[PDB]
Design a protein around this ligand. Structure first.
Ligand SMILES: CCCCCC[C@H]1C(=O)O[C@H](C)C/C=C/C=C/C=C/C=C/C=C(\C)[C@@H](O)C[C@H](O)C[C@H](O)C[C@H](O)C[C@H](O)C[C@H](O)C[C@@H]1O
Ligand code: HEM
Length: 397
């Protein structure tokens, strides 16, 4: 039996302790995963990039290595992207990217600022202490993406609850699929509504997009909306609560940011790299024999791109365990790489910049109200983070 992949973190803001020696000795190696299956663990930065850029790997993998039962949940089809291979991944991503453009992400900045300031108004009005996860981290990115999609305000809490029920590694396939099925009911209503009553929203723009092959039908819209809505809710929330917790535990770094809000672009790149919240790694399967880091991977063999390990490779950046927001941004792997690299990463960066800049400006003396060693971290979720973050700040006399 290949050694189990290290999971335990003695420092909750760092990778599992065992990872570094594995990456150093054998950045492509056999390991046993949570499901009990053996597969290839890829931990080295250059090798994860090579893995992710190689189009002979498929995302239609045989096992769910990160769940106990190993059962692969039934994934949505065309429009969802994450679970598609070329050539349909390529054409369908192009259709989505025609309307979900980086310039349109950029044009969300004033709305995202308003949402942030509104949730901080509510925090100041209630006074401290507060749990920043429930009052701010989960709520803000939900409002941003729900506004882009014209999701009625009374349904948004249900979307948030689906991400909490669905994006887990501590349950069986039946539980995960039931939450996926409830999400389909919400997506079906939303697509029907946009078709019936088009508006200034992203589904309505996709409905009218150039579509010579007639691929944009309701199932495609539901699948695209589901992937975008859930990814945008869960990942960004996790980064907000965890990057906040890390800065609140990093006094020299938080002082630099407080001195200079214009460093927040560098700080968000370093937070993404350092926290790499996709903690268990991306799964792929070889569709032909390939050589990866000089190791033969056989057709049909599953492989895990451990982006958290890769972002701590000392060959990628100097002293990678040092959290340093003054570093020049480098091309970390927090959004993946190659064909599947995050289509939403510019919107994610914009949200994080506005969130962290405004948060640390507007709550003077923000600081933890519960020590890190007592927080509940997300070892049980696909995306890492904290389940709660109690904070306090200077009182407004
Ligand atoms: C490189 C390191 C990162 C690895 C990340 C690994 C991480 C990931 O890729 O995250 C994305 C990057 C961001 C998350 C996106 C989430 C998308 C959810 C979309 C859901 C769509 C649902 C509909 C259309 C329903 O109508 C029909 C559908 O068929 C119902 C299914 O049941 C839904 C599945 O349950 C969803 C599945 O559970 C999510 C994966 O589990 C996410 C994965 O685990
Ligand atoms: C900080 C927040 C985010 C992180 C860390 C993140 C991470 C990632 C990663 C690692 C992947 C690639 C998965 C793989 O290769 O298997 C990805 C893909 C994807 N993400 Fe993001 N994501 C974030 C925010 C967003 C947002 C805001 C959106 C939507 C607006 C979004 C939409 C998507 C979609 C649709 C894909 C699939 C792209 C494809 O398969 O071609 N994500 N994300």
């Amino acid at each position: 039996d290949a050694p189990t992949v290290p999971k335990a973190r003695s420092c909750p803001f760092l990778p599992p302790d065992g990872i570094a020696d594995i990456r150093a000795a054998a950045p492509v190696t056999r390991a046993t995963f949570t499901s009990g299956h053996e597969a290839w663990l890829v931990t080295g930065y250059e090798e994860v990039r090579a893995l992710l850029r190689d189009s002979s790997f498929s995302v239609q993998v045989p096992h769910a290595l990160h769940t106990q039962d190993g059962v692969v949940t039934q994934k949505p089809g065309r429009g969802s992207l994450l679970w598609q291979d070329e050539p349909e991944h390529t054409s369908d991503r192009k259709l989505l990217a025609k309307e979900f453009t980086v310039r349109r992400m950029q044009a969300l900045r004033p709305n995202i600022q308003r949402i942030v300031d509104e949730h901080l108004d509510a925090i100041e009005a209630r006074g401290g202490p507060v749990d920043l996860v429930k009052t701010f981290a989960n709520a803000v990115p939900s409002m941003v993406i729900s506004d882009l999609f014209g999701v009625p305000v009374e349904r948004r809490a249900e979307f948030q609850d689906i991400a909490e029920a669905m994006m887990r590694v501590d349950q069986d396939a039946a539980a995960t699929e039931a939450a996926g099925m409830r999400l389909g009911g919400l997506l079906y209503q939303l697509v029907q509504e946009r078709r019936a009553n088009p508006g200034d929203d992203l589904i309505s723009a996709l409905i009218t997009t150039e579509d010579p092959d007639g691929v944009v039908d309701d199932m495609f819209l539901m699948n695209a909306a589901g992937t975008l809505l859930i990814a945008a809710h869960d990942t960004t929330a996790c980064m907000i609560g965890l990057g906040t917790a890390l800065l609140l535990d990093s006094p020299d770094q938080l002082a630099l940011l407080r001195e200079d809000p214009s460093l927040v672009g560098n700080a968000v790149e370093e937070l993404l790299r350092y926290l790499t919240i996709g903690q268990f790694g991306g799964e792929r399967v070889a569709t032909r024999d390939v050589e990866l880091g000089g190791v033969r991977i056989a057709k049909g063999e599953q492989v895990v791109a451990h982006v958290l390990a890769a972002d701590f490779d000392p060959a990628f950046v100097e002293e990678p365990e040092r959290f340093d927001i003054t570093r020049r941004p480098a091309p970390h792997l927090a959004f993946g790489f190659g064909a599947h690299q995050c289509i939403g990463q510019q919107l994610a960066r914009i949200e994080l910049q506005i969130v962290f800049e405004t948060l640390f400006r507007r709550l003077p003396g923000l600081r933890l109200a519960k020590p890190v060693e007592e927080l509940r971290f997300r070892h049980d979720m696909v995306f890492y983070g904290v389940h709660e973050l109690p904070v306090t700040w200077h009182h407004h006399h």
